[PDB]
Design an enzyme around this catalytic site. Structure first.
Site, mmCIF file in Angstrom:
data_model
loop_
_atom_site.group_PDB
_atom_site.id
_atom_site.type_symbol
_atom_site.label_atom_id
_atom_site.label_comp_id
_atom_site.label_asym_id
_atom_site.label_seq_id
_atom_site.Cartn_x
_atom_site.Cartn_y
_atom_site.Cartn_z
ATOM 1 N N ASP A 25 -12.716 5.838 3.908
ATOM 2 C CA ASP A 25 -11.182 5.872 4.266
ATOM 3 C C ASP A 25 -10.965 7.332 4.868
ATOM 4 O O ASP A 25 -10.672 8.170 4.078
ATOM 5 C CB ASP A 25 -10.559 5.775 3.135
ATOM 6 C CG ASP A 25 -8.938 5.551 3.183
ATOM 7 O OD1 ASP A 25 -8.626 5.930 4.374
ATOM 8 O OD2 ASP A 25 -8.322 5.263 2.237
ATOM 9 N N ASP A 67 0.957 -0.981 -0.100
ATOM 10 C CA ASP A 67 0.120 0.081 -0.070
ATOM 11 C C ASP A 67 0.960 1.081 -0.082
ATOM 12 O O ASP A 67 1.473 1.506 0.875
ATOM 13 C CB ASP A 67 -0.765 0.048 1.384
ATOM 14 C CG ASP A 67 -1.442 1.320 1.478
ATOM 15 O OD1 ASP A 67 -1.390 2.335 0.595
ATOM 16 O OD2 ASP A 67 -2.170 1.478 2.630
ATOM 17 N N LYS A 124 2.964 11.184 -3.588
ATOM 18 C CA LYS A 124 1.894 10.726 -4.089
ATOM 19 C C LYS A 124 0.753 11.694 -4.447
ATOM 20 O O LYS A 124 0.226 11.609 -5.242
ATOM 21 C CB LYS A 124 1.202 10.023 -2.990
ATOM 22 C CG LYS A 124 -0.145 9.292 -3.413
ATOM 23 C CD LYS A 124 -0.230 7.825 -2.672
ATOM 24 C CE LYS A 124 -1.843 7.674 -2.747
ATOM 25 N NZ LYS A 124 -1.977 6.189 -2.133
ATOM 26 N N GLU A 129 -7.601 0.993 -4.234
ATOM 27 C CA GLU A 129 -7.536 0.888 -2.590
ATOM 28 C C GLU A 129 -8.641 0.392 -2.021
ATOM 29 O O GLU A 129 -8.919 -0.594 -1.477
ATOM 30 C CB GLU A 129 -7.082 2.426 -1.910
ATOM 31 C CG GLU A 129 -5.429 2.417 -1.956
ATOM 32 C CD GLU A 129 -5.184 4.067 -1.802
ATOM 33 O OE1 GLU A 129 -5.609 4.801 -1.146
ATOM 34 O OE2 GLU A 129 -4.134 4.374 -2.512
#
Ligand code: GDP
Ligand code: GDP
Lengths: 378, 110
Positions: free
Chosen positions: A196, A7, A68, A172
């Site tokens: 999330d 991840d 990211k 994800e």
């Protein structure tokens, strides 16, 4: 060596492996199950993970993080433009593509976000290698569902540079749904809501699983919301209380604010399993000792707008997906902040008392699902 | 009425005292390195380079002291733990005097 699930997170990355009929989340060299997505450059070397993060005060301009937020993006992108004011490292324009400009081994070096992400991936590969005592080449790497092809390809490229054979790149919320075996369930189509909430970003995805086919129906969330904001409100509360009790302003001193902030993050974690947390900071500011406590009820009040605010993206995701909340078969919790009981209560109450899939550690669920996928593809 | 529970907290504090002594030694070495730069034959440019390498080492020292403070700030000692509370306060005041000496160096170089 076997195949792992990685991840690749904004602030923290996590690696797992399926072996002996179980998922093992692999702890790093510091005993941490999560490794900061941080890279540092110095006069003679490169640091990754914990080492890089800890050395940041010393080397702020040369300590790169948040790759990211830049990977697969154009220099002109809203996120890249908005974020650079904050980032201590320089972000330059190389023909429309952002690069991180750093001083490294006595020369000015520029790195693409995939080269930075490959350094983080190399560490995650090493983490798995030290645990298994075998070379690790194959990996399944996760990406956010809203990622476009350019972003997805850049993540795959970070894998290739890191020496990894990227078996599959998966969403994800798909990985979190795979972790709970929601595809193995029997019946008709299944509408799954993945909630999330981490440290800095909030992501809500609704997926429809029909005959093992995962279809992302909608995405919503908040780019800048997480556990740090909850810490902030606790800090505001204590600074105000210090003011009431002592008539002194601690905000003047950044070392006092930091000691209070570190204690606040820890007190917040205690409040997820306890209804009260106590703090004792000697000689906090102007020789005053700050001994205090906070109740879970007070912590909730301080963040009431932020916690409630989490339902707006949920209502929006339902709207884009053209669904009624009564149509949501499964709710999956992802991210460390979903451990907050009030957040859990708000989400359950919103879905008429439906139970939540929260048994797997929220911070590890994405790595968990990607470890199951990697095993399947071996 | 001295308790065994308090001895665990005193042990924690003893480990943190050792850690403080070790960082204190680094500070003294940085003070001796600073004297070295000041009293040596380095030209302006190399003096600037040397004091900046020292600036980085003093920021590291400050960070190590701040992490000691952050570890001490996890302690919860009830009123009855008088010996623990006095040791904790003394250790915090000792680190703050060290951070003030770090600042004297840090604020005035590079
Ligand atoms: N209240 C609470 N927050 C937690 C707990 N565990 C982790 N967090 C928070 O979760 C945040 C980190 O989120 P995470 O899922 O690990 O990843 P990120 O989205 O990439 O930052 C931090 O702000 C932590 O304080 C817990 O037990 N309780
Ligand atoms: N106040 C207090 N100190 C102790 C106690 N037990 C050990 N210490 C001391 O506190 C320090 C902690 O060290 P320890 O981990 O027990 O052993 P070491 O690593 O071999 O020195 C040493 O100086 C010990 O002698 C205790 O019950 N109370």
């Amino acid at each position: 060596g076997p195949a792992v699930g990685i991840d690749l997170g904004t602030t923290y990355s996590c690696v797992g492996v399926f072996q002996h009929g179980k998922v093992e989340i692999i702890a790093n060299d510091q005993g941490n199950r999560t490794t900061p997505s941080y890279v540092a450059f110095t006069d003679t070397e490169r640091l990754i993970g914990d080492a890089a993060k800890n050395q940041v005060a010393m080397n702020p301009t040369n300590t790169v993080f948040d790759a990211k937020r830049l990977i697969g993006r154009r220099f002109d992108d809203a996120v890249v433009q908005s974020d650079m004011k904050h980032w201590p490292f320089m972000v330059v324009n190389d023909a429309g593509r952002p690069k991180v400009q750093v001083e490294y081994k006595g020369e000015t070096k520029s790195f693409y976000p995939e080269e930075v992400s490959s350094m983080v991936l190399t560490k995650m590969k090493e983490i798995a290698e030290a645990y298994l005592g075998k070379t690790v080449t194959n990996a399944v790497v996760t990406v956010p569902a809203y990622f476009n092809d350019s972003q997805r390809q850049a993540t795959k490229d970070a894998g290739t540079i890191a020496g990894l054979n990227v078996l599959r790149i998966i969403n994800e919320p798909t990985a979190a749904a795979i972790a709970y075996g929601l595809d193995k369930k029997v019946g008709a189509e299944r509408n799954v809501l993945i909630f999330d909430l981490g440290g800095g970003t909030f992501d809500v995805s609704i997926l429809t699983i029909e005959d093992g086919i995962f279809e992302v129906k909608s995405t919503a969330g908040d780019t800048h919301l997480g556990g740090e904001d909850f810490d902030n409100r606790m800090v505001n509360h204590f600074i105000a209380e210090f003011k009431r009790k002592h008539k002194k302003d601690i905000s003047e001193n950044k070392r006092a604010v930091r000691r209070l902030r570190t204690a606040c993050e820890r007190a917040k974690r205690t409040l997820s399993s306890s209804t009260q947390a106590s703090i004792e900071i000697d000689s906090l500011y102007e020789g005053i000792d700050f001994y205090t406590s906070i109740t879970r009820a007070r912590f909730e009040e301080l963040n009431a707008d932020l916690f409630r605010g989490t339902l707006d993206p949920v209502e929006k995701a339902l709207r884009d997906a053209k669904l009624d909340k009564s149509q949501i078969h499964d709710i999956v919790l992802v991210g460390g902040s979903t451990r907050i009981p009030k957040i859990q209560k708000l989400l359950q109450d919103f879905f008429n008392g439906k139970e939540l899939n929260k048994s797997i550690n929220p911070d590890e669920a994405v790595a968990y699902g990607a470890a199951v996928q990697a095993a399947i593809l071996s | 009425s001295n308790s065994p529970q308090e001895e665990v907290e005193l042990k924690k504090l003893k480990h943190l005292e050792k850690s403080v002594e070790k960082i204190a030694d680094q500070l003294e070495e940085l003070n001796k390195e600073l004297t070295g730069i000041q009293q040596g034959f380095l030209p302006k440019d190399l003096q600037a380079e040397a004091l900046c390498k020292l600036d980085r080492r003093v920021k590291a020292t400050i960070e190590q002291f701040m992490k000691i403070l952050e570890e001490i700030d996890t302690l919860i000692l009830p009123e009855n733990f008088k010996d623990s509370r006095l040791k904790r306060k003394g250790l915090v005041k000792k680190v703050q005097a060290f951070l003030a000496e770090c600042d004297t160096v840090e604020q005035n170089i590079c």
